[PDB]
Amino acid sequence: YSASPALETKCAKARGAYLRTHFKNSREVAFTINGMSLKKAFIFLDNVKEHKQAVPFRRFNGGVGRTAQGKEFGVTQARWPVKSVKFFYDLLKNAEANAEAKGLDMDKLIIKHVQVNAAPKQLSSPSHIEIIVAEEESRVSLKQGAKARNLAARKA
Amino acid sequence: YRENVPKKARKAVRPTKLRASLAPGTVCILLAGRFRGKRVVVLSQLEDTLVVTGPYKVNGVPIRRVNHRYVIATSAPKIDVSGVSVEKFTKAYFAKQKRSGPVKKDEAFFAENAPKNALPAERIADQKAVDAKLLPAIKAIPNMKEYLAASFALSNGDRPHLMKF
Amino acid sequence: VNIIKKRTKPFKRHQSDRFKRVGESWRKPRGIDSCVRRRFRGTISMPKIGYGNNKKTRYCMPNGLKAFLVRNVSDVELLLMHNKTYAAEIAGNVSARKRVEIVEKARALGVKVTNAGA
Amino acid sequence: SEFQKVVVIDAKGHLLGRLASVVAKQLLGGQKVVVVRCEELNISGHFFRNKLKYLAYLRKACRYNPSRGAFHFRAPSRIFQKAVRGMLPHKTARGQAALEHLQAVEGIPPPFDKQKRVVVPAALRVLRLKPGRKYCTVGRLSSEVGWKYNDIVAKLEERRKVKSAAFYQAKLAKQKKIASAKEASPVNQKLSQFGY
Amino acid sequence: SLKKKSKRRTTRLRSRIEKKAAESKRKQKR
Amino acid sequence: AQGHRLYVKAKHLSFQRSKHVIHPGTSIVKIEGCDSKEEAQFYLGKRVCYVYKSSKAVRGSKIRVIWGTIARPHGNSGAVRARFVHNLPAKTFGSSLRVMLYPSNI
RNA sequence: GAAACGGAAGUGUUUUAUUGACUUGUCCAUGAAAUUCCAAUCUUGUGCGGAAUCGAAUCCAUUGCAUACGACUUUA
RNA sequence: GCGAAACCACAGCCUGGGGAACGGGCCAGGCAAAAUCAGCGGG
RNA sequence: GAAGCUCAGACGAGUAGGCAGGCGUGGAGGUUUGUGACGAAGCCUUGGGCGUGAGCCUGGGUCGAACAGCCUCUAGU
RNA sequence: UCUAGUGGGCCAUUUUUGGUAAGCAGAACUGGCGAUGCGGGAUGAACCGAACGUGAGGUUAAGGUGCCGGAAUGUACGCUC
RNA sequence: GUACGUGAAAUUGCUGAAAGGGAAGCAUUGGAAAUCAG
């Protein structure tokens, strides 16, 4: 994968390729849900699916409508792409299952790494998606040294 | 193969011409080293340096070589030097010991020498002999023992290019 | 005799940084109106014969030794009479066994090896 | 000639550009400068002439969205700061940093009225302008083009002078006492041969 | 400025002032 | 504690320059207390010093020093020219330098 | 350990009694050295084992005096 | 939710001056604080 | 390395154009007991070195089968 | 003896006949510019100096020394509100 | 790993570092941080 983590010590992995979702919306959802606790991310995705929270649009923010639900992230522009969230929800189900398989502690899991890459254009622009969940945790010169020696004797 | 023999350079060695006011028996300020700002009496005129000391009973500056470029020859009244011999101070007399290698360090190298062990008793005999032969002169003229005990330092509004030391 | 380099920065080609198609290698500006060809103030400099280094210190490493490319044991064996002038350079495509063989031979001859740490 | 950390200049009787040129040189020299009592700065030329010089400054304003246009500061401290800023390369980081080392205030605030105030003889009106030559004060010239704090600053200056005079009377009483004791000592004339 | 015009003569004026001075001198010579 | 300062305070003004060219080879030093060239002859040849502080601590000592020498008087108003081993950075215009009283000749 | 005063930005000033120093005003004794020719204040810091400390805002909802959406005025 | 293309040296505040064509870059100034949403299309 | 060594002096912008010496590429003849699965060529590189320059040598990583120096010939260079 | 490239124009000076409100036109000559960077004149095809290998140091030209800006808020004598 | 030898650039995403008040890029001189070299 992309990052030096995914060591089997305290990690679990999941990925998706050629997922039929827009690249830019998937990127914005990935950026937002990065670093959150795993169970915390789930309800947040449930909130976005049910319009009780919105994912900020930061890089691909062209023409987004301003909403009051983008206030928690400090931005003025927010949107609720539900297709990409459903793709992310399924991916997190699989990553959660892989965590079960390896045998971690699921209560303290965090989204350590998530990255969306462009896929062979087929037109739509598919997106490769990958998720990592894991756990948290001179010298002394002759004159300088001689002065150090004299001051050492001075204190005593 | 080649080992290019250096051409016979036509450079010789002549005695260094010290300044006019750097005569033996004068009082000068010390500008560098561990004793910067001290005032010390010049005993003898060496090849390049000045064999100079503050009376060790007065300020505690032992007999040292000092290069003449880091000396300000004050116009303080001269102290006689004919009463003390100065031939025993040579360049080899002041020189370091060998080193036996390019690198030596560590605090054990610091607990050695010090002003007790590698310091010979003959040096104190010379140092006390100098003090015996200069204290009567420094005592004769007023403020002199107090002048040498003090330290030289600049003040705000003190411009050295106008100060006549 | 200390080695002296008149210039250290290489002569980059004009606009070799604003384009990925124009390369770093130096090319002489041909245009009649080129402000670089007419050598205006502040414009980049052009290679000239005046930057040539001293013939006595030319082609010398920072330690005063000229590089000689060595591919087998025979090459270094030819360097025994110039251990003071030429330092051996093991070619990139020399196998591991030959490298240790050459480097041990070069040590025996007492000839400098620049990349013996391989 | 010798630098301090901060210099507080009493700007009464100094010419605008003559003082601003020296201050411009000292700021780039790397020294913090505080200019006090700006509302008594002087400018050559009679008052009506300079009033026209400043009312032409009021005419410069961008025709589109005048909030973008030039801002014509009226306070005497701000007029002096305009002189210095134009005498600095403010379009850089070293020119910008020179302004940050300059303080210009009208009157002498309590943070500075307890420190010595030096003057700049290269800019003093009595040493530069020929007698009989018309001149105008910046403090008057501001109170006629918009600055609306002339009277209060004059009011506070009057109180400050009263307090400062009372301090000086106390300091003179002490100083005359020690001077009596200064001359009383005999060692004075056994060091008189050294000129002290 | 302070004036009703600009004191810095634009380079056209710096251009044609001298030549028209030259034509004036030629006229006196004729 | 005023038994120190065996140096003379000075300031770095600019590089030796024309209006559109600078030569960082030599730096223009304003030795405070010197107000003409005949006075600047005294400090001609002294050891000038620029003292600054950094982030990394070498020698366990927080102070780095760039040595230099007074070379020539520069103008009428008592400024001098100085040659530092490393040309002073342009961020040090107005920074304070030290002028050691050595190599002494007085 | 206390009094007085300072509002222009009070960046403090002063009165103090106190303690403990220090104590060149003046004269003496000890010690510096082979660093043997130049190269105190400033706060985080991170914790120390002992003290005490117990707030708000937004989303969700509501209002309509406001409103393209934000925002704004309320309620909760 | 789906989702283009034209176009693209690089960019985008203003006044005066730069022989011309005076300009968006030069000079001298005015100045200059992220991210944006909707109108008017002035340029 | 007579195509070599050495000493001395002056000189140094440059369009069309004139002249000289070099760098690089594919293939051919000759030579180097030439390099190579104990890793050729290629590719990457905040690694190092050389040349005024065209360019060249090398460290580390990736890679997996061929490749280069010299003297000449040649050109879809 | 043979053999490439060029056969324009602009700017200013000096002459110079026709000339008119006024410019304007006419020739001949000169240099500079095309191939030319550098210092200065705020900036500039022609103004003032200066004809260029890589550097160090020293000294100047033109132009400057209040500040921007390196360099005397120099000295002396006047004029000007 | 059949979207299969080598896998370049343009181009995109993530992490780390740094900079940014109406551009940037480039050059000379050094400072700082990283990293080498004799």
PDB file of C-alpha atoms in Angstrom, chain D:
ATOM      1  CA  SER D   1      26.840  58.491  17.408  1.00  0.00           C
ATOM      2  CA  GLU D   2      26.073  56.024  20.203  1.00  0.00           C
ATOM      3  CA  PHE D   3      22.940  53.887  20.006  1.00  0.00           C
ATOM      4  CA  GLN D   4      20.394  53.181  22.704  1.00  0.00           C
ATOM      5  CA  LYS D   5      17.678  50.559  22.703  1.00  0.00           C
ATOM      6  CA  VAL D   6      15.030  53.256  22.180  1.00  0.00           C
ATOM      7  CA  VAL D   7      15.250  56.980  21.416  1.00  0.00           C
ATOM      8  CA  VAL D   8      12.414  59.333  22.351  1.00  0.00           C
ATOM      9  CA  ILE D   9      12.525  62.516  20.259  1.00  0.00           C
ATOM     10  CA  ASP D  10      10.644  65.614  21.388  1.00  0.00           C
ATOM     11  CA  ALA D  11       9.417  66.901  18.023  1.00  0.00           C
ATOM     12  CA  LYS D  12       8.685  70.512  19.011  1.00  0.00           C
ATOM     13  CA  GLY D  13      10.365  72.973  16.672  1.00  0.00           C
ATOM     14  CA  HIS D  14      11.661  70.358  14.230  1.00  0.00           C
ATOM     15  CA  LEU D  15      10.962  70.526  10.519  1.00  0.00           C
ATOM     16  CA  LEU D  16       8.806  67.795   9.018  1.00  0.00           C
ATOM     17  CA  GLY D  17      11.079  66.529   6.257  1.00  0.00           C
ATOM     18  CA  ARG D  18      14.331  67.440   7.979  1.00  0.00           C
ATOM     19  CA  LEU D  19      13.393  65.300  10.982  1.00  0.00           C
ATOM     20  CA  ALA D  20      11.829  62.547   8.864  1.00  0.00           C
ATOM     21  CA  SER D  21      15.024  62.167   6.836  1.00  0.00           C
ATOM     22  CA  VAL D  22      17.163  61.606   9.930  1.00  0.00           C
ATOM     23  CA  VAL D  23      14.564  59.223  11.363  1.00  0.00           C
ATOM     24  CA  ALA D  24      14.476  57.334   8.067  1.00  0.00           C
ATOM     25  CA  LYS D  25      18.242  56.835   8.254  1.00  0.00           C
ATOM     26  CA  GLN D  26      18.199  55.729  11.897  1.00  0.00           C
ATOM     27  CA  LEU D  27      15.414  53.194  11.341  1.00  0.00           C
ATOM     28  CA  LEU D  28      17.252  51.407   8.536  1.00  0.00           C
ATOM     29  CA  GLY D  29      20.305  51.695  10.768  1.00  0.00           C
ATOM     30  CA  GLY D  30      18.440  49.353  13.092  1.00  0.00           C
ATOM     31  CA  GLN D  31      17.214  51.431  16.014  1.00  0.00           C
ATOM     32  CA  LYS D  32      13.816  51.889  17.640  1.00  0.00           C
ATOM     33  CA  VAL D  33      12.677  55.516  17.504  1.00  0.00           C
ATOM     34  CA  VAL D  34       9.768  57.129  19.340  1.00  0.00           C
ATOM     35  CA  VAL D  35       8.711  60.581  18.159  1.00  0.00           C
ATOM     36  CA  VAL D  36       6.633  62.456  20.725  1.00  0.00           C
ATOM     37  CA  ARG D  37       4.824  65.787  20.622  1.00  0.00           C
ATOM     38  CA  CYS D  38       4.119  65.534  16.900  1.00  0.00           C
ATOM     39  CA  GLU D  39       1.435  68.221  16.923  1.00  0.00           C
ATOM     40  CA  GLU D  40       4.118  70.955  17.210  1.00  0.00           C
ATOM     41  CA  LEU D  41       6.093  69.932  14.117  1.00  0.00           C
ATOM     42  CA  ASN D  42       6.883  72.759  11.716  1.00  0.00           C
ATOM     43  CA  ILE D  43       6.821  72.986   7.922  1.00  0.00           C
ATOM     44  CA  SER D  44       8.377  75.726   5.814  1.00  0.00           C
ATOM     45  CA  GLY D  45       6.048  78.019   3.894  1.00  0.00           C
ATOM     46  CA  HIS D  46       3.119  80.057   5.147  1.00  0.00           C
ATOM     47  CA  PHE D  47       0.067  78.281   6.497  1.00  0.00           C
ATOM     48  CA  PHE D  48      -2.282  78.805   3.553  1.00  0.00           C
ATOM     49  CA  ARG D  49       0.362  77.465   1.154  1.00  0.00           C
ATOM     50  CA  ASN D  50       0.685  74.226   3.117  1.00  0.00           C
ATOM     51  CA  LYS D  51      -3.079  74.035   3.608  1.00  0.00           C
ATOM     52  CA  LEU D  52      -3.319  73.878  -0.189  1.00  0.00           C
ATOM     53  CA  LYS D  53      -0.529  71.293  -0.275  1.00  0.00           C
ATOM     54  CA  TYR D  54      -2.641  69.047   1.951  1.00  0.00           C
ATOM     55  CA  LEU D  55      -6.016  69.823   0.366  1.00  0.00           C
ATOM     56  CA  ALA D  56      -4.519  68.568  -2.888  1.00  0.00           C
ATOM     57  CA  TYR D  57      -3.735  65.342  -1.034  1.00  0.00           C
ATOM     58  CA  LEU D  58      -7.451  65.087  -0.215  1.00  0.00           C
ATOM     59  CA  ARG D  59      -8.153  65.201  -3.956  1.00  0.00           C
ATOM     60  CA  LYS D  60      -6.355  61.905  -4.682  1.00  0.00           C
ATOM     61  CA  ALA D  61      -8.872  59.064  -4.430  1.00  0.00           C
ATOM     62  CA  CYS D  62      -9.612  56.184  -6.786  1.00  0.00           C
ATOM     63  CA  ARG D  63     -12.702  56.944  -8.855  1.00  0.00           C
ATOM     64  CA  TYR D  64     -13.880  53.325  -8.525  1.00  0.00           C
ATOM     65  CA  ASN D  65     -14.836  52.327  -4.965  1.00  0.00           C
ATOM     66  CA  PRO D  66     -13.033  55.126  -3.073  1.00  0.00           C
ATOM     67  CA  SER D  67     -12.588  52.718  -0.157  1.00  0.00           C
ATOM     68  CA  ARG D  68      -9.823  51.354  -2.391  1.00  0.00           C
ATOM     69  CA  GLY D  69      -8.404  54.849  -2.850  1.00  0.00           C
ATOM     70  CA  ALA D  70      -5.656  56.570  -0.923  1.00  0.00           C
ATOM     71  CA  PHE D  71      -6.292  57.101   2.789  1.00  0.00           C
ATOM     72  CA  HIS D  72      -5.559  60.674   3.864  1.00  0.00           C
ATOM     73  CA  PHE D  73      -4.621  60.432   7.520  1.00  0.00           C
ATOM     74  CA  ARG D  74      -5.205  63.673   9.423  1.00  0.00           C
ATOM     75  CA  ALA D  75      -3.521  63.178  12.795  1.00  0.00           C
ATOM     76  CA  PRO D  76      -0.143  64.951  13.101  1.00  0.00           C
ATOM     77  CA  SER D  77       1.525  61.675  14.080  1.00  0.00           C
ATOM     78  CA  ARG D  78       0.112  60.082  10.929  1.00  0.00           C
ATOM     79  CA  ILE D  79       1.303  62.948   8.719  1.00  0.00           C
ATOM     80  CA  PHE D  80       4.816  62.543  10.115  1.00  0.00           C
ATOM     81  CA  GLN D  81       4.589  58.786   9.574  1.00  0.00           C
ATOM     82  CA  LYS D  82       3.631  59.456   5.951  1.00  0.00           C
ATOM     83  CA  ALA D  83       6.787  61.536   5.513  1.00  0.00           C
ATOM     84  CA  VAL D  84       9.006  58.785   6.925  1.00  0.00           C
ATOM     85  CA  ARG D  85       7.243  55.988   5.042  1.00  0.00           C
ATOM     86  CA  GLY D  86       7.771  57.741   1.716  1.00  0.00           C
ATOM     87  CA  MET D  87      11.444  58.053   2.693  1.00  0.00           C
ATOM     88  CA  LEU D  88      11.735  54.276   3.201  1.00  0.00           C
ATOM     89  CA  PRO D  89      11.611  51.290   0.830  1.00  0.00           C
ATOM     90  CA  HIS D  90       8.324  50.171   2.366  1.00  0.00           C
ATOM     91  CA  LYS D  91       7.610  47.918  -0.634  1.00  0.00           C
ATOM     92  CA  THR D  92      10.118  45.394   0.760  1.00  0.00           C
ATOM     93  CA  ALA D  93      10.608  43.455   3.988  1.00  0.00           C
ATOM     94  CA  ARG D  94      13.484  45.627   5.222  1.00  0.00           C
ATOM     95  CA  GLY D  95      11.536  48.804   4.524  1.00  0.00           C
ATOM     96  CA  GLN D  96       8.475  47.277   6.171  1.00  0.00           C
ATOM     97  CA  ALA D  97      10.564  46.366   9.222  1.00  0.00           C
ATOM     98  CA  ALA D  98      11.822  49.954   9.479  1.00  0.00           C
ATOM     99  CA  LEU D  99       8.297  51.285  10.012  1.00  0.00           C
ATOM    100  CA  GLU D 100       7.720  48.730  12.764  1.00  0.00           C
ATOM    101  CA  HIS D 101      10.645  50.336  14.619  1.00  0.00           C
ATOM    102  CA  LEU D 102       9.008  53.784  14.483  1.00  0.00           C
ATOM    103  CA  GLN D 103       6.491  55.175  16.965  1.00  0.00           C
ATOM    104  CA  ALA D 104       4.779  58.505  16.303  1.00  0.00           C
ATOM    105  CA  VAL D 105       2.428  59.895  18.948  1.00  0.00           C
ATOM    106  CA  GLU D 106       0.807  63.281  19.549  1.00  0.00           C
ATOM    107  CA  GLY D 107       1.841  64.576  22.946  1.00  0.00           C
ATOM    108  CA  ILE D 108       3.874  62.579  25.433  1.00  0.00           C
ATOM    109  CA  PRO D 109       1.992  59.576  26.882  1.00  0.00           C
ATOM    110  CA  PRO D 110       2.727  58.297  30.403  1.00  0.00           C
ATOM    111  CA  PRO D 111       4.854  55.395  29.076  1.00  0.00           C
ATOM    112  CA  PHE D 112       7.352  57.969  27.738  1.00  0.00           C
ATOM    113  CA  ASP D 113       6.980  61.214  29.707  1.00  0.00           C
ATOM    114  CA  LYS D 114       9.349  59.820  32.369  1.00  0.00           C
ATOM    115  CA  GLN D 115      12.318  59.481  30.002  1.00  0.00           C
ATOM    116  CA  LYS D 116      14.757  61.921  28.446  1.00  0.00           C
ATOM    117  CA  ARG D 117      13.674  63.489  25.140  1.00  0.00           C
ATOM    118  CA  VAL D 118      16.501  64.314  22.731  1.00  0.00           C
ATOM    119  CA  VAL D 119      16.339  66.680  19.751  1.00  0.00           C
ATOM    120  CA  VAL D 120      17.853  66.594  16.267  1.00  0.00           C
ATOM    121  CA  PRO D 121      19.857  69.763  15.461  1.00  0.00           C
ATOM    122  CA  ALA D 122      19.899  68.854  11.762  1.00  0.00           C
ATOM    123  CA  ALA D 123      16.138  69.535  11.731  1.00  0.00           C
ATOM    124  CA  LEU D 124      15.619  72.321  14.280  1.00  0.00           C
ATOM    125  CA  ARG D 125      13.733  75.291  12.867  1.00  0.00           C
ATOM    126  CA  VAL D 126      15.824  77.872  14.721  1.00  0.00           C
ATOM    127  CA  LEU D 127      19.015  76.597  13.057  1.00  0.00           C
ATOM    128  CA  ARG D 128      17.619  76.122   9.533  1.00  0.00           C
ATOM    129  CA  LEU D 129      15.017  78.737   8.569  1.00  0.00           C
ATOM    130  CA  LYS D 130      16.047  82.361   8.214  1.00  0.00           C
ATOM    131  CA  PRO D 131      14.317  84.732  10.667  1.00  0.00           C
ATOM    132  CA  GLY D 132      11.173  86.281   9.250  1.00  0.00           C
ATOM    133  CA  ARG D 133      10.354  83.239   7.108  1.00  0.00           C
ATOM    134  CA  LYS D 134       6.749  82.078   7.248  1.00  0.00           C
ATOM    135  CA  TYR D 135       6.067  78.612   8.638  1.00  0.00           C
ATOM    136  CA  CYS D 136       3.101  76.554   9.807  1.00  0.00           C
ATOM    137  CA  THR D 137       2.670  74.065  12.639  1.00  0.00           C
ATOM    138  CA  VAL D 138       1.378  70.590  11.825  1.00  0.00           C
ATOM    139  CA  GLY D 139      -0.882  70.622  14.876  1.00  0.00           C
ATOM    140  CA  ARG D 140      -2.712  73.691  13.621  1.00  0.00           C
ATOM    141  CA  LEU D 141      -2.700  72.329  10.071  1.00  0.00           C
ATOM    142  CA  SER D 142      -4.393  69.115  11.227  1.00  0.00           C
ATOM    143  CA  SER D 143      -7.077  70.841  13.312  1.00  0.00           C
ATOM    144  CA  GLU D 144      -8.263  72.539  10.130  1.00  0.00           C
ATOM    145  CA  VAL D 145      -8.451  69.534   7.781  1.00  0.00           C
ATOM    146  CA  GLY D 146     -10.234  67.047  10.003  1.00  0.00           C
ATOM    147  CA  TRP D 147      -8.201  66.092  13.066  1.00  0.00           C
ATOM    148  CA  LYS D 148     -10.603  66.514  15.960  1.00  0.00           C
ATOM    149  CA  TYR D 149      -8.424  65.980  19.040  1.00  0.00           C
ATOM    150  CA  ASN D 150      -6.330  69.157  19.088  1.00  0.00           C
ATOM    151  CA  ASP D 151      -7.953  70.658  22.182  1.00  0.00           C
ATOM    152  CA  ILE D 152      -7.888  67.487  24.301  1.00  0.00           C
ATOM    153  CA  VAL D 153      -4.192  66.910  23.555  1.00  0.00           C
ATOM    154  CA  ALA D 154      -3.490  70.522  24.481  1.00  0.00           C
ATOM    155  CA  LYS D 155      -5.568  69.985  27.624  1.00  0.00           C
ATOM    156  CA  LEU D 156      -3.554  66.912  28.609  1.00  0.00           C
ATOM    157  CA  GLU D 157      -0.267  68.620  27.735  1.00  0.00           C
ATOM    158  CA  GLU D 158      -1.040  71.438  30.176  1.00  0.00           C
ATOM    159  CA  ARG D 159      -1.595  68.952  33.001  1.00  0.00           C
ATOM    160  CA  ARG D 160       1.549  67.015  32.072  1.00  0.00           C
ATOM    161  CA  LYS D 161       3.673  70.170  32.107  1.00  0.00           C
ATOM    162  CA  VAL D 162       2.357  71.011  35.583  1.00  0.00           C
ATOM    163  CA  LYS D 163       3.309  67.562  36.879  1.00  0.00           C
ATOM    164  CA  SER D 164       6.651  67.727  35.075  1.00  0.00           C
ATOM    165  CA  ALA D 165       7.425  71.160  36.525  1.00  0.00           C
ATOM    166  CA  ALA D 166       6.617  69.946  40.041  1.00  0.00           C
ATOM    167  CA  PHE D 167       8.998  67.020  39.548  1.00  0.00           C
ATOM    168  CA  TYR D 168      11.727  69.370  38.340  1.00  0.00           C
ATOM    169  CA  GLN D 169      11.336  71.671  41.341  1.00  0.00           C
ATOM    170  CA  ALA D 170      11.728  68.661  43.634  1.00  0.00           C
ATOM    171  CA  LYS D 171      14.714  67.436  41.618  1.00  0.00           C
ATOM    172  CA  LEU D 172      16.325  70.891  41.707  1.00  0.00           C
ATOM    173  CA  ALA D 173      15.846  71.130  45.485  1.00  0.00           C
ATOM    174  CA  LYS D 174      17.614  67.798  45.930  1.00  0.00           C
ATOM    175  CA  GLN D 175      20.223  68.699  43.301  1.00  0.00           C
ATOM    176  CA  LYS D 176      21.109  72.032  44.914  1.00  0.00           C
ATOM    177  CA  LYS D 177      21.438  70.270  48.277  1.00  0.00           C
ATOM    178  CA  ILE D 178      23.915  67.669  47.019  1.00  0.00           C
ATOM    179  CA  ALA D 179      25.791  70.366  45.092  1.00  0.00           C
ATOM    180  CA  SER D 180      26.254  72.227  48.376  1.00  0.00           C
ATOM    181  CA  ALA D 181      27.566  68.993  49.891  1.00  0.00           C
ATOM    182  CA  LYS D 182      29.488  68.330  46.664  1.00  0.00           C
ATOM    183  CA  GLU D 183      31.537  71.515  47.025  1.00  0.00           C
ATOM    184  CA  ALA D 184      31.705  71.083  50.822  1.00  0.00           C
ATOM    185  CA  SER D 185      34.007  68.065  50.533  1.00  0.00           C
ATOM    186  CA  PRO D 186      37.740  68.949  50.616  1.00  0.00           C
ATOM    187  CA  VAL D 187      38.838  66.164  48.278  1.00  0.00           C
ATOM    188  CA  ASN D 188      37.178  68.155  45.480  1.00  0.00           C
ATOM    189  CA  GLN D 189      40.239  70.404  45.083  1.00  0.00           C
ATOM    190  CA  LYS D 190      42.690  67.604  45.797  1.00  0.00           C
ATOM    191  CA  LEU D 191      41.358  66.086  42.588  1.00  0.00           C
ATOM    192  CA  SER D 192      40.949  69.470  40.862  1.00  0.00           C
ATOM    193  CA  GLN D 193      44.303  68.988  39.119  1.00  0.00           C
ATOM    194  CA  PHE D 194      42.583  66.300  37.012  1.00  0.00           C
ATOM    195  CA  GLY D 195      39.936  68.738  35.761  1.00  0.00           C
ATOM    196  CA  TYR D 196      37.009  67.218  37.654  1.00  0.00           C
TER     197      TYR D 196
END
